[PDB]
Amino acid sequence: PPHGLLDRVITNVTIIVLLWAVVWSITGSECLPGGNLFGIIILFYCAIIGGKLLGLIKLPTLPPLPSLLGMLLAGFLIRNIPVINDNVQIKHKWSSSLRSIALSIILVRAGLGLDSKALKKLKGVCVRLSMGPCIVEACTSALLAHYLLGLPWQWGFILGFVLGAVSPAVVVPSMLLLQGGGYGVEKGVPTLLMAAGSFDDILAITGFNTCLGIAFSTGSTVFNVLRGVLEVVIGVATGSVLGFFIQYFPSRDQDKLVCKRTFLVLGLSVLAVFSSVHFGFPGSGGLCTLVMAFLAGMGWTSEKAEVEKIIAVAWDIFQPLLFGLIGAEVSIASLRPETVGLCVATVGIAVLIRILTTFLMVCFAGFNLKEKIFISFAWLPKATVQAAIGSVALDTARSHGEKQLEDYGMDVLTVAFLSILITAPIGSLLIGLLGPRLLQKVE
Amino acid sequence: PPHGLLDRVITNVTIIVLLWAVVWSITGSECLPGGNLFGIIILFYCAIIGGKLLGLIKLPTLPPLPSLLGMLLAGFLIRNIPVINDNVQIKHKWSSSLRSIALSIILVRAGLGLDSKALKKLKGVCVRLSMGPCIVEACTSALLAHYLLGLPWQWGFILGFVLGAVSPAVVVPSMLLLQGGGYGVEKGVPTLLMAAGSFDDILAITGFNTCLGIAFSTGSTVFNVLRGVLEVVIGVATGSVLGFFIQYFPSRDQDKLVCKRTFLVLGLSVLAVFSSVHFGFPGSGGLCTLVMAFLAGMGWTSEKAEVEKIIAVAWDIFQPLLFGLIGAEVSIASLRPETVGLCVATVGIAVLIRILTTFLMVCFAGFNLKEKIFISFAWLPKATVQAAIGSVALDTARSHGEKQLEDYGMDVLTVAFLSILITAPIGSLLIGLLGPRLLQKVE
Ligand SMILES: CCCCCCCC/C=C\CCCCCCCC(=O)O[C@@H](COC(=O)CCCCCCCCCCCCCCC)COP(=O)([O-])OCC[N+](C)(C)C
Ligand SMILES: CCCCCCCC/C=C\CCCCCCCC(=O)O[C@@H](COC(=O)CCCCCCCCCCCCCCC)COP(=O)([O-])OCC[N+](C)(C)C
Ligand SMILES: CCCCCCCC/C=C\CCCCCCCC(=O)O[C@@H](COC(=O)CCCCCCCCCCCCCCC)COP(=O)([O-])OCC[N+](C)(C)C
Ligand SMILES: CCCCCCCC/C=C\CCCCCCCC(=O)O[C@@H](COC(=O)CCCCCCCCCCCCCCC)COP(=O)([O-])OCC[N+](C)(C)C
Ligand SMILES: CCCCCCCCCCCCCC
Ligand SMILES: CCCCCCCCCCCCCC
Ligand SMILES: CCCCCCCCCCCCCC
Ligand SMILES: CCCCCCCCCCCCCC
Numbered sequence: 001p002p003h004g005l006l007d008r009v010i011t012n013v014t015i016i017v018l019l020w021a022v023v024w025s026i027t028g029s030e031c032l033p034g035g036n037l038f039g040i041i042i043l044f045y046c047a048i049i050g051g052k053l054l055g056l057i058k059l060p061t062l063p064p065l066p067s068l069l070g071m072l073l074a075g076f077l078i079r080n081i082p083v084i085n086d087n088v089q090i091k092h093k094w095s096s097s098l099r100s101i102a103l104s105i106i107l108v109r110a111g112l113g114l115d116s117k118a119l120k121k122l123k124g125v126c127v128r129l130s131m132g133p134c135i136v137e138a139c140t141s142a143l144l145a146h147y148l149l150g151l152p153w154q155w156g157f158i159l160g161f162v163l164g165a166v167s168p169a170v171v172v173p174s175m176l177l178l179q180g181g182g183y184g185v186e187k188g189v190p191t192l193l194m195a196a197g198s199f200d201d202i203l204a205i206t207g208f209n210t211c212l213g214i215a216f217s218t219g220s221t222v223f224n225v226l227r228g229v230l231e232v233v234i235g236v237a238t239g240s241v242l243g244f245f246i247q248y249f250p251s252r253d254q255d256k257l258v259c260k261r262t263f264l265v266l267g268l269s270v271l272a273v274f275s276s277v278h279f280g281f282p283g284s285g286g287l288c289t290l291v292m293a294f295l296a297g298m299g300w301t302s303e304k305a306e307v308e309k310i311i312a313v314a315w316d317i318f319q320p321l322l323f324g325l326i327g328a329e330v331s332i333a334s335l336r337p338e339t340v341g342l343c344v345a346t347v348g349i350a351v352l353i354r355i356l357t358t359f360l361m362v363c364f365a366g367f368n369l370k371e372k373i374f375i376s377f378a379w380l381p382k383a384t385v386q387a388a389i390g391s392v393a394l395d396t397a398r399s400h401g402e403k404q405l406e407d408y409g410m411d412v413l414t415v416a417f418l419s420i421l422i423t424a425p426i427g428s429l430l431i432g433l434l435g436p437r438l439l440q441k442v443e
Numbered sequence: 444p445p446h447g448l449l450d451r452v453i454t455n456v457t458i459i460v461l462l463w464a465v466v467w468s469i470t471g472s473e474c475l476p477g478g479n480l481f482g483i484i485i486l487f488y489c490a491i492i493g494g495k496l497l498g499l500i501k502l503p504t505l506p507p508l509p510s511l512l513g514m515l516l517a518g519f520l521i522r523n524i525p526v527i528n529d530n531v532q533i534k535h536k537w538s539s540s541l542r543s544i545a546l547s548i549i550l551v552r553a554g555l556g557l558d559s560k561a562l563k564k565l566k567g568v569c570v571r572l573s574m575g576p577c578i579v580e581a582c583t584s585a586l587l588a589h590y591l592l593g594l595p596w597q598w599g600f601i602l603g604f605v606l607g608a609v610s611p612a613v614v615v616p617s618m619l620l621l622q623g624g625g626y627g628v629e630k631g632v633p634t635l636l637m638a639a640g641s642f643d644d645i646l647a648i649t650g651f652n653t654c655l656g657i658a659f660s661t662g663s664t665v666f667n668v669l670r671g672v673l674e675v676v677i678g679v680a681t682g683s684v685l686g687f688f689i690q691y692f693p694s695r696d697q698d699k700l701v702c703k704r705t706f707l708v709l710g711l712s713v714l715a716v717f718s719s720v721h722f723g724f725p726g727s728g729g730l731c732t733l734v735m736a737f738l739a740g741m742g743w744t745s746e747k748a749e750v751e752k753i754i755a756v757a758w759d760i761f762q763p764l765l766f767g768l769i770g771a772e773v774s775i776a777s778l779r780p781e782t783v784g785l786c787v788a789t790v791g792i793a794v795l796i797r798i799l800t801t802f803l804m805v806c807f808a809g810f811n812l813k814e815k816i817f818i819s820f821a822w823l824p825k826a827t828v829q830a831a832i833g834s835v836a837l838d839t840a841r842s843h844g845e846k847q848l849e850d851y852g853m854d855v856l857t858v859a860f861l862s863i864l865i866t867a868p869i870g871s872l873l874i875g876l877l878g879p880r881l882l883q884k885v886e
């Protein structure tokens with residue numbers, strides 16, 4: 001009987017072709033070249049293959065390049081080459097929905113990992129580094145945007161806020177592995193960097209929106225700023241009652257306990273994220289999800305372990321989709337070759353600023369010198385939020401049909417997209433590599 | 444903490460509402476009253492609730508009424524009441540696809556249950572009772588249709604063939620439970636009634652089609668009859684090479700063996716059924732599926748057990764859909780109150796004929812008197828095939844815009860639909876009840 005490497009390769013080859021064939025027969029022409037479902041399948045497979053090649057087969061001689069770069073490049077190539085783009089076209093409604101489900105899963109993993117005791121003695125620090133680096137980065141980037149790019153102050157600040165928000169899709173997967181090995185759980189570094197990801201997106205989007213309106217002179221600053229406060233209050237209130245809801249009603253006397261639990265947390269997480277966007281309170285589905293998952297984890301003292309394993313498997317299926325799609329938005333017709341060298345300057349200097357301010361924010365928390373550096377370098381990655389709100393400024397500029405504001409809009413897109421390419425791949429490397437050396441592994 | 448019956452009821456109530464809510468938020472207005480996805484969800488839940496009430500809560504005092512009747516009635520009520528019909532509307536493409544997947548799953552379970560040694564010494568019997576009762580039932584029903592209904596000979600024979608084919612969705616689930624208890628595996632009755640379901644549908648559809656064309660004087664009888672022979676040859680040829688394909692390449696040295704195997708058999712089964720319908724050879728996806736699953740089971744000597752458990756769970760999810768949808772095709776505007784009493788006569792007498800001829804076909808197989816009666820009464824149920832091809836004659840009659848042929852078409856629909864209501868519910872009862880008493884349970 002055939003066996004060994006010959007057996008394994010032919011088993012996967014059929015599955016790839018079968019998974020297309022099975023979907024094709026049921027759905028028909030949607031799963032053929034130029035169809036919505038065809039775009040999803042091979043973007044899934046191109047991202048998976050792209051991830052394997054870079055990290056394992058092509059270039060492992062340097063410090064192991066993470067699969068984030070491979071998936072991000074696979075979407076980049078699919079989008080830009082015209083011969084392979086016209087045959088691969090996912091609709092925007094399916095694009096946002098799949099990314100939102102990826103966001104829903106990652107927050108559930110983040111919520112089910114936070115240590116209650118560790119979060120207790122780290123509350124001022126979580127607030128500081130969530131809103132401290134982001135505001136200073138917003139100002140410092142806006143200072144540079146007014147001089148290196150020449151954008152006015154209003155367009156400087158939307159550039160700052162779009163460049164400010166950290167991404168929990170790069171940090172949380174990396175720090176959960178460190179928590180699995182207990183590399184820093186003595187003092188709470190892994191829980192520090194997974195809980196702070198909530199409020200920085202509320203500040204960034206609220207900062208982006210209220211500074212976007214004043215650039216177009218529509219709406220009022222009072223509601224846009226007050227919305228950000230309301231996102232917090234309804235996020236906790238909805239999240240709190242849902243947290244005690246799941247913590248009791250699936251009880252230890254049922255049969256399909258694990259199956260019923262994992263459906264409840266992730267199903268309500270998907271409900272929270274999509275409904276909040278629909279009803280007009282974006283970002284209240286990420287604070288709700290993180291709160292309800294955390295509280296649900298405090299009643300699931302030791303029986304939460306089986307839940308997160310199923311969530312971990314789901315993330316492995318959605319990571320190629322999320323990062324592959326993100327690279328699929330960046331074109332080269334929305335970027336300007338006149339300004340790429342000094343659009344690296346604003347991103348390059350702002351990262352230096354972001355590292356510097358993150359040092360001071362954590363400088364009074366009892367951590368030693370080494371953990372401050374690790375937190376300083378692990379707060380950089382910026383992937384999901386820049387993709388979500390990068391093109392909003394340019395898209396709104398074209399809707400109003402102005403002239404000069406599209407020139408400003410493209411530069412925001414370049415900074416929003418260059419930030420993903422040069423920070424997220426290097427952010428993942430620093431978290432994985434510097435982790436074991438700096439943090440104190442538990443005896 | 445809340446517990447007991449209060450805890451269990453509220454856990455399910457949320458899941459029903461959550462499963463609608465989660466789908467609604469992602470999809471939008473499709474999952475609202477008057478939407479395709481809304482029709483599916485509550486048809487799923489109405490069929491499930493309808494099944495529970497009849498068999499357990501409402502009427503268990505009589506011999507336990509099977510859940511087939513409950514699901515069949517739930518679809519019947521949803522279709523006919525106008526206030527609950529306009530709010531529940533599944534599209535035909537989704538209707539056929541979900542029923543075809545249910546057909547694909549049931550044949551996989553049938554294929555993975557056949558005993559190779561038992562099928563060896565029962566081959567003439569399998570051929571006889573597959574084509575013996577069906578042909579005599581086709582003739583006897585056509586004899587009655589020409590007198591009791593008054594239909595001419597051409598419309599008599601399409602009435603015979605639409606009324607001939609047995610259904611493997613009622614027999615196979617019932618006989619697999621008997622095989623689980625080993626109620627008749629000494630001589631091979633369970634394998635006898637699961638393997639014969641293949642060729643009777645090839646004969647019925649081929650008999651239906653070639654007699655349908657001559658009723659409308661289109662096409663030629665040579666190809667329509669020759670198609671039925673070709674369905675057998677390509678069904679085995681495609682099924683055989685696929686059977687040895689799966690039997691080797693997932694080998695005992697892999698990790699996700701069970702997951703990879705169960706995807707292969709059911710994925711290829713779905714591919715076989717849908718592609719054959721698309722390419723124009725219906726029924727070659729049921730013989731292919733039964734053959735490939737059987738051969739795959741002969742290399743999976745003892746490691747096939749874990750596969751069929753996952754298939755069994757999938758069937759429990761698709762049984763409400765299949766039987767609920769079947770009852771959702773039967774209206775009361777396509778039935779004629781002038782002729783229901785004597786349309787029971789043709790169905791009533793034909794069942795008596797079908798039982799009588801099934802006795803003789805099995806009368807020389809070494810079985811004793813008791814097992815012949817059990818096989819005689821377990822060959823009756825007729826649900827899936829009548830639903831699939833019942834309305835084809837009337838639908839084609841309206842397309843040609845004739846006058847008299849719609850009168851003949853409605854009567855075929857009444858017989859095709861009355862056959863499901865009075866044979867399948869009573870067929871399931873006889874298989875379950877008479878089973879333990881007549882068959883010889885293994886010591
Ligand atoms: C919760 C209670 C329910 C219980 C669960 C049941 C839930 C369902 C679960 C399993 C059943 C699978 C669904 C079968 C029926 C849908 C398919 C279909 O008919 O699409 C139709 C429309 O489709 C569309 O136009 C929209 C695209 C989404 C289709 C469904 C997505 C999944 C398709 C893959 C399924 C995954 C495969 C399995 C996993 C690998 C196709 O029609 P068409 O596009 O017009 O083609 C004609 C093209 N032409 C016009 C150009 C000629
Ligand atoms: C936006 C998305 C919303 C959410 C999406 C859903 C995501 C999550 C959904 C599902 C993922 C969770 C289930 C994973 C598989 C089971 C793994 C498992 O842990 O078993 C668990 C239960 O399971 C069983 O006991 C086996 C029987 C399962 C049948 C229930 C059907 C579920 C699949 C239907 C799928 C529909 C398919 C058709 C759809 C077209 C636990 O059993 P155990 O491990 O043996 O331990 C015993 C537990 N005990 C000790 C407490 C007693
Ligand atoms: C294989 C490799 C890929 C990896 C796996 C990924 C595969 C996917 C797996 C999980 C992701 C779930 C899919 C998310 C994106 C699709 C939803 C969507 O946007 O539909 C859109 C279209 O949809 C349609 O019009 C056709 C209907 C089928 C939609 C998909 C079926 C499943 C929807 C439930 C999903 C199951 C929930 C979870 C289980 C409980 C909705 O747009 P709309 O209808 O126009 O709304 C506007 C209405 N209006 C115009 C009137 C205003
Ligand atoms: C038309 C339809 C086409 C077909 C449809 C597919 C139907 C079937 C598909 C899936 C059903 C089969 C899987 C059921 C769940 C596992 C149960 C199981 O038996 O585990 C098995 C493997 O599984 C594992 O080892 C656990 C890890 C699974 C990850 C693989 C992802 C599969 C889910 C992705 C779903 C996509 C979700 C997102 C989609 C939007 C066996 O592990 P074990 O029991 O521990 O025994 C050890 C085995 N051993 C001894 C040989 C070593
Ligand atoms: C086991 C692998 C099976 C592959 C089947 C491929 C069938 C593809 C047919 C495409 C024809 C397109 C018709 C519109
Ligand atoms: C949002 C999409 C949900 C997909 C969940 C898939 C679950 C797969 C894990 C099942 C494996 C159970 C044994 C570990
Ligand atoms: C999405 C359709 C089901 C896919 C199941 C198998 C998942 C394949 C990707 C998982 C990651 C593999 C490399 C770690
Ligand atoms: C846990 C149960 C949550 C139920 C949420 C129900 C939300 C339904 C809102 C429907 C509004 C329709 C807007 C078009």
Ligand SMILES: CCCCCCCCCCCCCC
Pocket residue numbers: 544752753756757
């Ligand atoms: C055609 C639709 C396929 C749906 C398959 C669902 C599989 C559910 C069974 C998983 C349970 C695994 C442990 C018994």
Ligand SMILES: CCCCCCCCCCCCCC
Pocket residue numbers: 491759760
């Ligand atoms: C179809 C969406 C997933 C459903 C999972 C739970 C299955 C519910 C029906 C199973 C039968 C329950 C009564 C035996």
Ligand SMILES: CCCCCCCCCCC
Pocket residue numbers: 008009012013
């Ligand atoms: C450890 C051997 C695993 C073999 C998988 C690599 C081959 C996959 C081919 C996918 C096209």
Ligand SMILES: CCCCCCCCCCC
Pocket residue numbers: 016017020032033041042045
């Ligand atoms: C993901 C593998 C896809 C294999 C088929 C490619 C599309 C073929 C369409 C018909 C030429």
Ligand SMILES: CCCCCCCCCCC
Pocket residue numbers: 153154157207210211214
């Ligand atoms: C000086 C012109 C106005 C520039 C916009 C300032 C926005 C500051 C942040 C608002 C939250």
Ligand SMILES: CCCCCCCCCCC
Pocket residue numbers: 256259260263458
């Ligand atoms: C009776 C089992 C209840 C738990 C599973 C229900 C939801 C399944 C996931 C739906 C996608």
Ligand SMILES: CCCCCCCCCCC
Pocket residue numbers: 234238272275276279280281284285288
């Ligand atoms: C000021 C009240 C807002 C109405 C509620 C709509 C938003 C729902 C948020 C769900 C997380």
Ligand SMILES: CCCCCCCCCCC
Pocket residue numbers: 451452455456
């Ligand atoms: C053995 C107790 C199980 C409770 C389930 C029955 C209540 C379900 C309510 C569904 C609406």
Ligand SMILES: CCCCCCCCCCC
Pocket residue numbers: 459460463475476484485488
């Ligand atoms: C299967 C339970 C469905 C609960 C909601 C019914 C539809 C409500 C639509 C908005 C009135």
Ligand SMILES: CCCCCCCCCCC
Pocket residue numbers: 596597600650653654657
């Ligand atoms: C005597 C008129 C022709 C009636 C049709 C006979 C069909 C017999 C079965 C064909 C396979």
Ligand SMILES: CCCCCCCCCCC
Pocket residue numbers: 015699702703706
């Ligand atoms: C690497 C796991 C391969 C087995 C599972 C692939 C198919 C999953 C089912 C797709 C619906």
Ligand SMILES: CCCCCCCCCCC
Pocket residue numbers: 677681715718719722723724727728731
């Ligand atoms: C006479 C040759 C028919 C062409 C093959 C198309 C049918 C494929 C059947 C798949 C089971």
Ligand code: NA
Pocket residue numbers: 165166167168196197198200201
């Ligand atoms: Na964040």
Ligand code: NA
Pocket residue numbers: 608609610611639640641643644
């Ligand atoms: Na049959």
